[PDB]
Amino acid sequence: EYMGFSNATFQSEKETGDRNYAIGYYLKEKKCFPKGVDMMAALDLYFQLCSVEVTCESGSVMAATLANGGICPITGESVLSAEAVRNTLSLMHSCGMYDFSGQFAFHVGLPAKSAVSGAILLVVPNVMGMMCLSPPLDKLGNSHRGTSFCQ
Amino acid sequence: FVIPDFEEFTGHVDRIFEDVKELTGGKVAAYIPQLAKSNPDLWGVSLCTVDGQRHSVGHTKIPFCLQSCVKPLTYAISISTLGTDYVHKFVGKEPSGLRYNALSLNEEGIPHNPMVNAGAIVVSSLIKMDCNKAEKFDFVLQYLNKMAGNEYMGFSNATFQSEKETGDRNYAIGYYLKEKKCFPKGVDMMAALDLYFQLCSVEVTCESGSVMAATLANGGICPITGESVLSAEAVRNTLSLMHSCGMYDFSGQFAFHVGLPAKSAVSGAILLVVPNVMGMMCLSPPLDKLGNSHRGTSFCQ
Amino acid sequence: FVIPDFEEFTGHVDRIFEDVKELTGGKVAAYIPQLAKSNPDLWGVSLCTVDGQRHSVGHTKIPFCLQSCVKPLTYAISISTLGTDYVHKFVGKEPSGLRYNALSLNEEGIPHNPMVNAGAIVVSSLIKMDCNKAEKFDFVLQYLNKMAGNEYMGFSNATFQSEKETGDRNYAIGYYLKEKKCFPKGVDMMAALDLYFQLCSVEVTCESGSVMAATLANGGICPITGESVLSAEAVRNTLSLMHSCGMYDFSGQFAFHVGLPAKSAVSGAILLVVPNVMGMMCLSPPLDKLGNSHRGTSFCQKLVSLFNFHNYDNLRHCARKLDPRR
Amino acid sequence: LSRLGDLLFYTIAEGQERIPIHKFTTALKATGLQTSDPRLRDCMSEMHRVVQESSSGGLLDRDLFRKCVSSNIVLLTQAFRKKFVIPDFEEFTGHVDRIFEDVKELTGGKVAAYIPQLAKSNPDLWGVSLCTVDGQRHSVGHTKIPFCLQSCVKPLTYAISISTLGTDYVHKFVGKEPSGLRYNALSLNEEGIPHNPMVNAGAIVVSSLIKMDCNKAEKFDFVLQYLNKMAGNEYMGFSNATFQSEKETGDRNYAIGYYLKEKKCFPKGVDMMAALDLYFQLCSVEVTCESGSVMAATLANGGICPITGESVLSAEAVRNTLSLMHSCGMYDFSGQFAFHVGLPAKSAVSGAILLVVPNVMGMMCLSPPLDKLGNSHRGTSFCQKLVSLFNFHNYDNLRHCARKLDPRR
Ligand SMILES: NC(=O)CC[C@H](N)C(=O)O
Ligand SMILES: NC(=O)CC[C@H](N)C(=O)O
Ligand SMILES: NC(=O)CC[C@H](N)C(=O)O
Ligand SMILES: NC(=O)CC[C@H](N)C(=O)O
Numbered sequence A: 001e002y003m004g005f006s007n008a009t010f011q012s013e014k015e016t017g018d019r020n021y022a023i024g025y026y027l028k029e030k031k032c033f034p035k036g037v038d039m040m041a042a043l044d045l046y047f048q049l050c051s052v053e054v055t056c057e058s059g060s061v062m063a064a065t066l067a068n069g070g071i072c073p074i075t076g077e078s079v080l081s082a083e084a085v086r087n088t089l090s091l092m093h094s095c096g097m098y099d100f101s102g103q104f105a106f107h108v109g110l111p112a113k114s115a116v117s118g119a120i121l122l123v124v125p126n127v128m129g130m131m132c133l134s135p136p137l138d139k140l141g142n143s144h145r146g147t148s149f150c151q
Numbered sequence B: 001f002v003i004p005d006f007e008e009f010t011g012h013v014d015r016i017f018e019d020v021k022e023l024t025g026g027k028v029a030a031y032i033p034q035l036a037k038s039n040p041d042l043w044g045v046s047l048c049t050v051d052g053q054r055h056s057v058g059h060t061k062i063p064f065c066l067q068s069c070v071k072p073l074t075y076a077i078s079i080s081t082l083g084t085d086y087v088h089k090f091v092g093k094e095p096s097g098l099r100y101n102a103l104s105l106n107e108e109g110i111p112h113n114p115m116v117n118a119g120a121i122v123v124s125s126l127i128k129m130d131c132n133k134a135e136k137f138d139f140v141l142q143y144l145n146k147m148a149g150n151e152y153m154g155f156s157n158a159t160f161q162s163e164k165e166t167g168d169r170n171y172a173i174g175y176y177l178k179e180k181k182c183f184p185k186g187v188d189m190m191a192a193l194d195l196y197f198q199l200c201s202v203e204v205t206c207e208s209g210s211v212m213a214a215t216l217a218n219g220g221i222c223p224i225t226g227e228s229v230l231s232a233e234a235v236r237n238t239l240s241l242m243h244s245c246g247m248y249d250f251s252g253q254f255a256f257h258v259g260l261p262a263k264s265a266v267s268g269a270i271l272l273v274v275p276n277v278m279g280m281m282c283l284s285p286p287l288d289k290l291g292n293s294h295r296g297t298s299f300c301q
Numbered sequence C: 001f002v003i004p005d006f007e008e009f010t011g012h013v014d015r016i017f018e019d020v021k022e023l024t025g026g027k028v029a030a031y032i033p034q035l036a037k038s039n040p041d042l043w044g045v046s047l048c049t050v051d052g053q054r055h056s057v058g059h060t061k062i063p064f065c066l067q068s069c070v071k072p073l074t075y076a077i078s079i080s081t082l083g084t085d086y087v088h089k090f091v092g093k094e095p096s097g098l099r100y101n102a103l104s105l106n107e108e109g110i111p112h113n114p115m116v117n118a119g120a121i122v123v124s125s126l127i128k129m130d131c132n133k134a135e136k137f138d139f140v141l142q143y144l145n146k147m148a149g150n151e152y153m154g155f156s157n158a159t160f161q162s163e164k165e166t167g168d169r170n171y172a173i174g175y176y177l178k179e180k181k182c183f184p185k186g187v188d189m190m191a192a193l194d195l196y197f198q199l200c201s202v203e204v205t206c207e208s209g210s211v212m213a214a215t216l217a218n219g220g221i222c223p224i225t226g227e228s229v230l231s232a233e234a235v236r237n238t239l240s241l242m243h244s245c246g247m248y249d250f251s252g253q254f255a256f257h258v259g260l261p262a263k264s265a266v267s268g269a270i271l272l273v274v275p276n277v278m279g280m281m282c283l284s285p286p287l288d289k290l291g292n293s294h295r296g297t298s299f300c301q302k303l304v305s306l307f308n309f310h311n312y313d314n315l316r317h318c319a320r321k322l323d324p325r326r
Numbered sequence D: 001l002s003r004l005g006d007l008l009f010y011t012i013a014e015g016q017e018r019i020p021i022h023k024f025t026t027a028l029k030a031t032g033l034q035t036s037d038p039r040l041r042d043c044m045s046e047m048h049r050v051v052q053e054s055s056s057g058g059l060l061d062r063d064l065f066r067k068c069v070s071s072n073i074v075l076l077t078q079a080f081r082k083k084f085v086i087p088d089f090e091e092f093t094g095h096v097d098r099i100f101e102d103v104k105e106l107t108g109g110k111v112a113a114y115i116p117q118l119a120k121s122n123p124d125l126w127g128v129s130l131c132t133v134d135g136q137r138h139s140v141g142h143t144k145i146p147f148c149l150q151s152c153v154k155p156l157t158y159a160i161s162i163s164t165l166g167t168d169y170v171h172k173f174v175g176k177e178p179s180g181l182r183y184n185a186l187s188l189n190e191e192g193i194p195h196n197p198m199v200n201a202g203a204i205v206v207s208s209l210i211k212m213d214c215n216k217a218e219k220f221d222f223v224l225q226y227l228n229k230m231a232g233n234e235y236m237g238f239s240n241a242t243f244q245s246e247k248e249t250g251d252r253n254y255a256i257g258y259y260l261k262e263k264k265c266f267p268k269g270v271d272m273m274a275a276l277d278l279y280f281q282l283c284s285v286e287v288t289c290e291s292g293s294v295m296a297a298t299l300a301n302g303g304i305c306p307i308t309g310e311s312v313l314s315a316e317a318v319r320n321t322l323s324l325m326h327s328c329g330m331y332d333f334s335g336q337f338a339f340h341v342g343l344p345a346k347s348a349v350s351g352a353i354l355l356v357v358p359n360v361m362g363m364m365c366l367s368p369p370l371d372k373l374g375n376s377h378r379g380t381s382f383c384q385k386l387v388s389l390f391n392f393h394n395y396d397n398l399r400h401c402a403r404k405l406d407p408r409r
Helices: A007-016 A018-029 A039-050 A056-067 A082-095 A144-150 B006-021 B070-082 B084-088 B117-125 B133-147 B157-166 B168-179 B189-200 B206-218 B232-245 B294-300 C006-021 C071-087 C117-125 C133-147 C157-161 C169-180 C189-201 C206-211 C232-245 C248-257 C294-307 D005-012 D038-050 D062-068 D073-080 D089-103 D153-165 D200-208 D216-231 D240-244 D252-262 D272-284 D289-294 D315-328 D331-340 D377-388
Strands: A112-114 A120-124 A128-132 B044-049 B054-058 B153-155 B202-204 B269-274 B278-283 C044-049 C054-058 C202-204 C278-280 D127-131 D137-141 D361-366
Touching: A007 A039, A018 A039, A018 B168, A056 A082, A056 A120, A056 A128, A082 A120, A112 A144, A120 A144, A128 A144, B006 B044, B006 B054, B006 B294, B044 B206, B054 B206, B070 B084, B070 B117, B070 B133, B070 B189, B070 B206, B070 B232, B117 B168, B117 B189, B133 B153, B133 B189, B133 B206, B133 D240, B157 B189, B157 D216, B157 D240, B157 D272, B168 B189, B189 B202, B202 B206, B206 B232, B206 B269, B206 B278, B232 B269, B232 C248, B269 B294, B278 B294, C006 C044, C006 C054, C006 C294, C044 C206, C054 C206, C071 C117, C071 C133, C071 C232, C117 C169, C117 C189, C133 C189, C157 C189, C169 C189, C189 C202, C202 C206, C206 C278, C232 C248, C248 C294, D005 D062, D005 D073, D038 D062, D038 D073, D089 D127, D089 D137, D089 D377, D127 D289, D137 D289, D153 D200, D153 D216, D153 D272, D153 D315, D200 D252, D200 D272, D216 D272, D216 D289, D240 D272, D252 D272, D289 D361, D315 D331, D331 D377, D361 D377
Parallel strands: none
Antiparallel strands: A112 A120, A120 A128, B044 B054, B044 B278, B153 B202, B269 B278, C044 C054, C044 C278, D127 D137, D127 D361
16 A cells, blocks of 8 residues: 655654654663664664655554454455564553553553554454544644544 | 972872872773773872972873863863853753763753763853864863963874764763753754863873863962963852762762862873862772772872 | 951941842742741841851841751761761762652662751661650750750740641651661661651741851851860761752752852751851741742852852952951 | 993093093983983983982992993994994084075965864974984974874875785775876776875775774774884874864865775775774874974884884885885875985875985974975975985985095995
8 A cells, every 4th residue: 555755754853853862872872782783774764664654544454454463454465473463462552652551551442553643553453453643642642633532 | 389398298198199009999991992991000190289389109191081070171161251151051050969971951951060971061062162173172172281381282082083983872962962952052962072072082191180170279370381261250160060060979978078179080080179279180090880080089088 | 356347247248138138039838837827028147256256137036947957967966976987877978969858869778968858867866766755855955055055945846746747758758768778776767757857846046046057167166155066077077068968959059159058948047157257047938949048048149259258269369359357 | 242341431431530420411412312212211210219329429430330231232332433324413414404494485385275273383384303214313493393194194004004914905905006186186097996095095995904893993093003113102192173174174085985985996894984084083193293203214214113123014014105105105296206306205285294215314394385286395395405415316326426425434
């Protein structure tokens, strides 16, 4: 499905994503990365991936892949292993939305991943996947309309 | 002169020098590659009265870096040029309580003091922010030479490249400060951080730095050249921070026991100051737990 | 005497006294409702030269509680009667930079310094732990009376019953210290915690308060009576902590602009000390955000800028700043 | 076999029964060989402690001196018997001083269009120093002012690589022929490598060969240790002011580095920036004419520092770099220099000329003013004049020629 790249956002985050640079150098001092691994290339890739563009239709299928045991429903390819999905969903439930991981497992109970672009990659295991877009965010860095819709 | 009996004074200094030479020390600061190269047995002391009396025992002439002893100097340089209110509008003036790394800021959103790594970058950011890198270092080096009475004022690019390629924590603080709007508008972070690494890598002997500390004791007048390098208020501020913030966490246990304005460094330097009397500097590489030389700090006590 | 021409010296203080009188702060005391009842328009100062030469202008006749200004004293009681080595086994000697409540211990598990509330409880626990509660209070009171030269020394029971029914952070600190086992063996924490409240609730006038801070401006010997209250090492030990830890977070700011050992207090007291010169005790109930009197801090700031009392003046020439005791 | 030092002292003395102590400390350096050499350091060390308890209170005595100076006996014999390779050193320095005065009148121009930290230097700064292959030294003028070693480390750093990596590995990546296209020279030879190590395009590549596996600190630290041994542990610093210049504003070098990386002319798995950064660091090393004269006297010899006698450079390294500085050291002006001077010299925008006279001596001039091609105006004149009055040209001393000063007699 649609898969682009917001270079404008990519350049807005490289030049202004100052906290993400502190973490990269903070990690580098603690030897958190593997041996013989450049942090700048790894940090840069994180900026690139965060800039990937999709639509809600593309995101919904992207979430449905996690729902259907890491097998995309509309192509059927075994793109992801069963262990990857179980590990991924079990972490979005407890770590998907950071501080709002609670108050979402509490009110919604589903593994959903929030973003500052308004998206909420909502996953219903063995049923469907859903992505809700609304740029307006609340204090905890989650979309307000999206999380109200989920509840 | 302020010490008429200087001949007997050296009789006590050398006795204490040999008294503490038997002690061992802690780690030798191996977390940056270059400083591990130093021989931990180096031990020397130099002093300079505000009249010009000078004595040296040990390895005083072996060069070493002002890895953190340049923070009071660059601070005094900034205060003397821009004014107290302007400088401290960007950097606090109170002790932090954490280590010198201290990737954190006070309630106001500015670094705690001009002696922690976060504050040393900001004061380095304030030195002639509208010029290029060569002029920035030359402006600071010019006063440092005058502080030292035109003594040996060198540079150790081996350390500068070692730190610039390995000092990742200082990069974390630099990008943390830039994210919190801790720099004046239109000022680049990397230029300030790079300048801070350059100042940290300035190489001085104990003789060069003993007169450099005696300037602060003499209050902005180099005793052996009659200069007027620093304003009276600038040194009064530097000694007020270097007292309560000079040795980081060990500021207590030093103000308690020694009660003098001193500044430590990971290279073993201790830029001791005795106001209205003299300025002393001690070199001993092997550090202690909180980032100061075991022999030097015990010698001061 | 160390201050000749006393008329000239006091005259300058009087002019500064009126100048600071216009400034108004706020937030007298969020807690201890008994302290929130004090008059915000109350402002008094007093001094006592190391040789008895004393002056006082303002509201120096109104008793006020000695909250957190007895910490440098009660520390001096323990440091002299138990030595420096024993006392600092249980309390550090470095600033915390985390306010005075500061439910936080240093790296090695002991409270940061005697001046924070966590350290004042421990040092208060060291004073005659084998005796009963009446004797523990009386033991410190006898030295406290001797420090002030048998001047006025009351006890505001109104403020002591407050700070105990409503003073809960001190209890949380007290039980926190018990969990970490940073008390001497065979000691009841509650008895030591209660002793801290009582010492805090002692009330003195500025005129009597200025006698204190002139005792320890000297080498412990009282200026009025000439007695020998505290050991000379005790005064050095506590002064070196008041400079670094006296005002808590504001210690750096105070040491920068004033550079004298001063101890803050929620009652508005500031036990300012000028070593080998005199001892000051300002009073202004309204505080700043950091727990310091707005008028008292302003007076200390202005006085140092005119009298050369800073720790790092007289470098070569500096400003004139009047005659420095010569 | 017998040690004739006892009779040698009688020759050293003027023949009188006594001599004041004051006359021995002073006026003894007239022979050129300084009193600060490490070789004779042992003599000065011991005498300082024996004076307190000697029952003479100011007498060194002959018997005591002979016993202590035992292992270093051979060196002193050549010094005072005038058996060095340059005798009558007073006349040699006397002529040198004369041209130093005469050449001082000249004035060039265009001190530095770029590297602003070089444009701040005093145009009227002029000095020279020479340290013969035997360590005999004489300096006059402003020799004590540190100056950057830009483009003088190129012959040295080339010698470092070859002596540690072989002649065939180094020259796989850099040619050995002059280019005649200035020192910047964004151009490669027919076989796709920089024309010679002396141009900027080659100096970066040879700088890339020095410990390509180590980190930045050790790469610089490796070379600086050799440069200390080459200079005999004389003054050797690092001008960070000029290193921060030539890196923010030195842009033609960056183009060469990226141009070279484009042609894949670096070794395998080597970062151009790390090699280019080292080129700026080596270029930024500051040395005085007095200290920098021992350099160009180390490689005037067969790779041994004349002062300490340490073996620092392979004789093949010195032979190769000397054969290379002659035709490529001074860029376009190499032919003009080789025509009138005919000596291995290396230019610099900081006024330095690393003059070399193999088997004889090695000089180091200093004149911040430049000529059009990037060579010091005053320094070049001294070399041209000096050769015309000392026969240092390679193709002189045919059989008898004219008198031409003393012909080794
Ligand atoms: N929602 C998010 O995790 C936003 C990530 C974003 N790249 C940031 O650094 O702030
Ligand atoms: N406190 C120190 O001595 C270290 C100084 C050095 N600039 C660093 O932060 O690594
Ligand atoms: N000055 C203060 O910090 C007040 C302390 C508080 N009254 C107590 O008893 O602990
Ligand atoms: N001609 C030279 O000496 C070159 C100077 C210096 N290496 C530069 O390229 O800027």
